[PDB]
């Protein structure tokens, strides 16, 4: 049985940055993310007990710079009954810009100001519940930086901005399990 | 030509951690490292203006956690005379465990405690200058994580420990440009 | 392409700003705009990353000589902006400069420069509001001693604004700016 | 046996200026330099007791204007055992130098020098202890303004140690020091 | 595997005195010395766990008289991986006078005054980095004593004197592992 690592963040942006820091620290597989509602989302990774332990710590320190970290824990050897009843994966590049706003109106204005500021592509939006919505844009590292900065400013005068972050080079394992507009397929 | 990125740290451990965080943060190429003596080393990355500047900000925050950073700067378009006269690369995986001590005695005791803790391989030692030496060990993440914690506790009772860090999966560009015992 | 602008109330501060931009990154100086009253604006264009790195590099060098008014970068300008505004996208000898808010003080400045060493007075630039700039060219040794002697002789006459010397101006500066070395 | 004169400086720039002022003062031969590490370098000259004593005093007065002068001593008649066990030599274009205790500060200084004027960066010298020195050559005027611009850009990066320019270095300096003009 | 004994001293004079006291106290072998730069040098001896411990304490006791004793440690049973990657000696008489100066100019004046004071022979000089240089002379204990005391008084007028020591009868093992002009 592979190890289990989880990071829960009240915010879709903080969970993505946490997932990006975990797959870059050690060799762990990002099986996906669990949405419990009310903005709470949980990134789930699996691998070796030491690789998960190191990635769990590295992801928490990187996620504290963007969003609210709720719980962070590592299970060395999860029971077989846990993997059977819970969606934990083992049940038998382009730059990234993100803006999370507690309000659908504030997220639309943030996305409208991003595609007009620089050469970026709005791949869509993510609903984490509780009124939290996240605009996801992809493009060049110089473009999404100038886009999110212009989008965050234009959105602070409309709604309640939760988190704004830019990932210059997201890992290949992140774009495979997370809906970030670059899923190969 | 390409852009230029440099991070100088008075410590071989803080430079490797900075170089590892840069090649992972953006699309940059680590051409190598420069030793100016007295414990000073400088990691040199190159790429485009946007990626080098975005990788340099990530390498600084990761280096300040371990080593004593000295200088952090980016040059957008270096002159042709600079690339020709300076070694900047444009002249026409196992786990990583490192312990740095300003003293040869403290480094040997730390290296002896690392190989005795778990199954790790002592690839050798790096002499930074000015009494600075760094013991480098490789192996699996389970053994390297426990070897350094046993080596640091046994090295502080001997000499002056500078920095102790562990990299679970170092980037392929790091093992290719730095003498970390895994160069093909 | 991106857009970069630096506005300085002084023709000398704009040339040093434009010279520092094309040397720092890979951008093209499309020209300059004179809005009158001594206000001039250097306009460069390129990619989003290079324009940002060059705009601040030119601002840091322009603050040493002249009064910087505004500095801004537009990442992706709308196509209607480039069609109605002169922003470039529309469908070497040394440099010695002395700017004076007075025509009398500028003539004495230019007279003392050509007498100190062997330089060529290519002409003068009128930026409006009483601001005039004397431009001399030559080797680095001459324009260094010419401007220093011309600065001391001009302060005793008029209101000196700025004095600066660029040893090797970039090839893009002499192409877009009237500095007597246009191919 | 010949006489002996030495000047030790914690700075490669201060040692070169000390060596230049010595061979220009009296009839002495610069036999080379010794690097002891940690930024300490020593200039060694040989000649007659009259020439080595006037050059040593003339090199100390000029070396104090740039870097830290560690020791200065003259030996009139060294023992034969000293010349047998110690490397004491017994058995032009302008010069611009910028020394920084940090490799990053030296690169930014070297980049700003070749961008400011038409000077050639011949390379860099590593004296140990983190001390590195960028060496550029050219004419007396451009290398003067290049080092001034390279020093201004390096202060906002690292620790600048010494900055100096030599108009016409002696032929004995270029023959014993790796300054890019060695025959 | 033989025992490991190391004594690190920021000064070449203190390292030679510590090495001379180790081979005379117990039955150990001096494999050599390690130079890490910045004036730091490490004397490495090897023998049994008891002889190394007794000689190491005797070396530190004599090294505290001249120079900075940085680190002192004894590894009883060193791992075979340490001896493979580190130069620790296990891999597959006339009087002595020394004057250490943090300055090349003061070291030359000290060496010149020594050979002129008494009948001694200047064998050479050792560079330990960081500006530290050590002049070494050999001869009779009467002449070496009179030479070092005259060279120190002349060297203090020039540079920074670090340490001055005289060994009347250095052990034969010291002259074989250290560059002191009397190597067979």
Q: What is the dihedral of CA A125, A126, A129, A133, to 10 degrees?
A: -40
Do both A117 and A75 map to the same domain?
A: no
Q: Do D145 and C140 touch (CB under 8 A)?
A: yes
**In three state form, how does the secondary structure of D17-36 look?**
HHHHHHHHHCCEEEEEEEEE
Do both C134 and C81 map to the same domain?
A: no
Closest chain B CA to residue C48? B50
Q: Do B77 and C48 touch (CB under 8 A)?
A: no
* Deposited resolution, Å: 3.6
Do A and D touch (≥3 CB pairs < 8 Å)? Answer: no
Give the helix/strand (H/E) hosting C153. helix C140-155
Q: How far is B2 from chain C (nearest CA, A)?
A: 10
Question: What total number of domains does chain D contain?
Answer: 2
- Which structural domain, as residue segments, surrounds residue B177? 93-184
Closest chain A CA to residue B22? A169
Do both D60 and D75 map to the same domain?
A: yes
What was the experiment behind these coordinates? X-ray
Do both D125 and D65 map to the same domain?
A: no
Q: Do C48 and A146 touch (CB under 8 A)?
A: yes
Interatomic CA distance for residues C66 and A47, integer angstroms: 60
Residue numbers in D near E128 (CB within 8 A): 37
B25 closest CB neighbour out of A51, A145, A169: A169
Do D and B touch (≥3 CB pairs < 8 Å)? Answer: yes
Cβ-based interface (< 8 Å): residues of B facing E: 37-39, 102-106, 108-109, 111-112, 115-116, 121-125, 127-133, 158-159
A117 closest CB neighbour out of C47, C49, C75: C75
Q: What is the dihedral of CA C105, C109, C115, C117, to 10 degrees?
A: 170
Q: Do B8 and D38 touch (CB under 8 A)?
A: no
Q: Do D12 and D97 contact (CB within 8 A), yes or no?
A: yes
The residue of B2, B76, B81, B82 whose CB has the most chain C CBs within 10 angstroms, and thus the best one to mutate to test that interface, is B76
Do both E97 and E181 map to the same domain?
A: yes
Interatomic CA distance for residues C124 and C135, integer angstroms: 6
CA dihedral sign of residues E144, E150, E155, E161: positive
Q: What are the DSSP calls for C35-68, one per residue? A: EETTEEEEEEEE-HHHHHHHHHHHHHHHTTTS-E
Q: Which two tokens stand for residue E166?
A: 């005289």
Do both D109 and D172 map to the same domain?
A: yes
Interatomic CA distance for residues D40 and D70, integer angstroms: 8
Do both C100 and C182 map to the same domain?
A: yes
In terms of Cα–Cα distance, which of B110, B92, B88, B85 is closest to B163?
Answer: B110
Give the helix/strand (H/E) hosting D175. helix D171-176
Q: How far is D29 from chain C (nearest CA, A)?
A: 32
Three-state secondary-structure class, residue D141:
coil
State residue D139 phi and psi, 5-degree precision. Answer: -90, 165
Q: Do B175 and B93 contact (CB within 8 A), yes or no?
A: yes
Do both C127 and C182 map to the same domain?
A: yes
- A34-38, Cβ contacts within 8 angstroms, sequence gap of 24 or more: A34/A87, A35/A128, A35/A129, A36/A129, A37/A128, A37/A129, A37/A130, A38/A10, A38/A129, A38/A130, A38/A132
Complete edge-to-edge strand list for the sheet that includes strand D3-10 = D28-37, D40-47, D3-10, D69-75
Q: Which two tokens stand for residue E138?
A: 């050999």
Residue numbers in A near C47 (CB within 8 A): 142
Do both A82 and A142 map to the same domain?
A: no
Contacting chains of E (3 CB pairs or more, <8 Å) are B, D
Helical residues (DSSP H) of chain E, grouped into ranges: 12-25, 49-63, 80-85, 104-117, 141-155, 172-177
Angle at B155 between CA B153 and CA B158, to 5 degrees: 125
Q: What are the DSSP calls for E160-178, one per residue? A: -EEEEEEESS--HHHHHHS
Residue numbers in E near D7 (CB within 8 A): 105
Closest chain A CA to residue C75? A118
E103 closest CB neighbour out of D70, D78, D86: D70
Name B37's Cβ contacts closer than 8 Å, sequence gap at least 6: B129, B130, D37, D38, D126, D127, D128, D129, D130, D131, E37
Do both C70 and C104 map to the same domain?
A: no
Interatomic CA distance for residues A150 and A145, integer angstroms: 9
Do B and C touch (≥3 CB pairs < 8 Å)? Answer: yes
Interatomic CA distance for residues D156 and D100, integer angstroms: 12
Length of chain A equals 185
Q: Do E10 and B131 touch (CB under 8 A)?
A: yes
Residue numbers in E near D37 (CB within 8 A): 37-38, 127-132
E135-154 burial, b if ≥16 CB within 10 A, otherwise e? bbbbbeeebbbbbbebbbeb
Instruction: List the beta bridge partners of residue B167.
Output: B96
Residue numbers in B near D118 (CB within 8 A): none
Name A85's Cβ contacts closer than 8 Å, sequence gap at least 6: none
In terms of Cα–Cα distance, which of D34, D31, D33 is closest to D52?
Answer: D31
In terms of Cα–Cα distance, which of A128, A103, A162 is closest to A33?
Answer: A128
Instruction: Give Cα separations from E19 to B115, B184, D24, E31, E100 (angstroms).
Output: 28, 40, 48, 10, 16
Three-state secondary-structure class, residue B155:
helix
Q: After which residues is chain B broken (C to N over 2.5 A)?
A: 92
Which of B51, B74, B92 is the last residue in one of the domains?
B92
Instruction: Give Cα separations from A136 to B21, D131, E62 (angstroms).
Output: 24, 48, 70
Interatomic CA distance for residues B83 and E150, integer angstroms: 53
Cβ-based interface (< 8 Å): residues of E facing B: 4, 6-8, 10, 34, 36-40, 42, 70-73, 75, 78-79, 81-82, 84-86, 88, 129-130
Complete edge-to-edge strand list for the sheet that includes strand C2-9 = C28-36, C39-46, C2-9, C68-74
Q: How far is C165 from chain D (nearest CA, A)?
A: 9
Q: Which two tokens stand for residue D134?
A: 């960028």
Contacting chains of D (3 CB pairs or more, <8 Å) are B, C, E
Do both B142 and B64 map to the same domain?
A: no
Do both B14 and B61 map to the same domain?
A: yes
Which of D47, D69, D91 is the last residue in one of the domains?
D91
Interatomic CA distance for residues E118 and E97, integer angstroms: 12
Closest chain D CA to residue B33? D103
D130 closest CB neighbour out of B37, B82, B85: B37
In terms of Cα–Cα distance, which of C58, C9, C49 is closest to C29?
Answer: C58
Which of D60, D76, D91 is the last residue in one of the domains?
D91
Q: How far is A39 from chain B (nearest CA, A)?
A: 27
Interatomic CA distance for residues D69 and A52, integer angstroms: 56
Give the helix/strand (H/E) hosting B173. helix B172-177
């Amino acid at each position: 049985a592979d190890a289990l690592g989880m990071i829960e963040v009240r915010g879709f942006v903080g969970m993505v940055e946490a997932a990006d820091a975990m797959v870059k620290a050690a060799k762990v597989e990002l099986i996906g993310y669990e949405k419990t509602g009310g903005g709470y989302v949980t990134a789930v990774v699996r691998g070796d007990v030491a690789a998960v332990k190191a990635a769990t710590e590295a992801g928490q320190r990187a996620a504290e710079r963007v969003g609210e970290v709720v719980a962070v824990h590592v299970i060395p050897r999860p029971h077989v009954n846990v993997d059977a009843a819970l969606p934990l994966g083992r049940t038998p590049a382009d730059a990234l810009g993100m803006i999370e706003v507690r309000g659908f109106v504030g997220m639309v204005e943030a996305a409208d100001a991003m595609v007009k500021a620089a050469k970026v592509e709005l791949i869509g939006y993510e609903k984490t519940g509780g009124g939290y919505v996240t605009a996801v844009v992809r493009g060049d590292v110089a473009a999404v930086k100038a886009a999110t900065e212009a989008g965050q400013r234009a959105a602070e005068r409309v709604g309640e901005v939760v988190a704004v972050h830019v990932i210059p080079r997201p890992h290949v394992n992140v774009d495979a399990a997370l809906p970030l507009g670059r899923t190969p397929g």
